[PDB]
C-alpha cells in the first residue's frame with residue numbers, strides 16, 4: 001500500500017543529517033518491505049543514487065526513533081541538480097522524549113523493576129518500530 | 139497573560155498562559171490563574187516549563203531543532219509528570 | 226535575536242523571553258507587569274553582578290548561545306522593601322533522588 005514506484009528514472013539525492021543522531025535511511029521496496037541502507041553519522045551528508053517515485057523514511061540507527069525529512073515523515077525523490085533530503089529531529093512530545101531517555105539507561109529486562117505505573121512499563125516496552133509506523137499511515 | 143504553576147515544595151513558576159495551555163491537563167485545571175502541583179517537585183516542574191518554551195519555539199520551524207536535554211537523575215520523575223500532564 | 230530567561234527571586238521563577246538588543250530597564254518593566262513592583266524597587270543580577278539599566282541584555286552576557294529555550298539563562302532579582310534593598314537570595318530547586326540501581 002506504501003511502496004516505491006518502479007519508474008527506472010534516476011534521481012540523485014543528498015541525504016543531509018542535520019540531527020545529533022546516527023541516521024538509518026530506510027527504502028520501501030516494490031513490495032513495501034522496509035530495506036535499511038548504510039547509516040549516516042551526526043552532521044554528515046551522502047550523495048546517493050535513487051529514482052523518481054521511490055519512498056524513503058529515516059530513523060535513529062540505534063533506537064528506531066522516528067525522524068523528519070524536509071519537515072515530513074516520507075521522502076520521495078523528484079525530477080532533477082540533486083534533491084536535498086534534510087533529515088532533522090522532530091519536536092518529540094515530552095513523554096516520548098522521557099521514554100527515549102529511560103530506554104537508553106535501562107535494559108529491557110529491568111523495565112519491570114522501575115517504580116512507575118504499569119501503563120508506563122507498557123509504554124517503555126512499546127519501542128519505536130518502522131513496521132508499527134507503516135501500519136498505518138492510512 | 140501569565141499563569142502561576144506551584145511545585146510540591148512551594149516554588150512558584152510564572153509562565154505565559156499560551157505556553158502553559160500546551161498541556162491539556164493544565165487547561166482543565168485552569169478552567170486565579172494559579173495551579174498547585176502536589177506531586178510535582180521543583181526540579182521536575184522547572185524542566186516542564188523549559189519544555190513549553192522549547193515546544194512553542196521549535197514547533198512549525200524550518201530551523202535545525204536541537205535535542206531537548208534530560209539529565210538521567212530527573213528522567214523517571216519527569217516521565218511521570220509528562221504522563222499526567224499529557225505533554 | 227530572542228533570548229530566553231528565568232528571572233529568579235526567593236521561591237519565584239519567571240520564564241520569559243526578550244530581545245538581545247533590549248535593556249535591563251525594559252526587563253524590569255516586564256517584572257513590574259507580572260510582580261507589580263516598579264523598576265526603582267528592583268535590582269537585576271547576572272550571578273552576583275549587579276546589572277546597569279541602560280545596558281542591553283547582549284552586553285550583560287545574555288546571548289542566543291547562552292540563553293536558549295531548553296536551557297534558559299538565570300537573572301537574579303532583589304526587591305527594595307522600604308528604602309533598603311534586600312540581599313540577593315534565590316532558593317535552590319529540590320534535589321533529585323539517587324539514580325536507581327538499574328540506571
Ligand SMILES: CC(=O)N1C[C@H](O)C[C@H]1C(=O)NCc1ccc(-c2cnco2)cc1
Nearest residue numbers: 015025027037038039046048049050051054
Ligand atoms: C533499486 C535501487 O537501485 N535503489 C533503491 C533506492 O532508490 C536506492 C537505489 C540504490 O540502491 N542506489 C545505490 C545506493 C547505494 C548506497 C546508498 C547509501 C549509502 N549510504 C546511505 O545510502 C544509497 C543508494
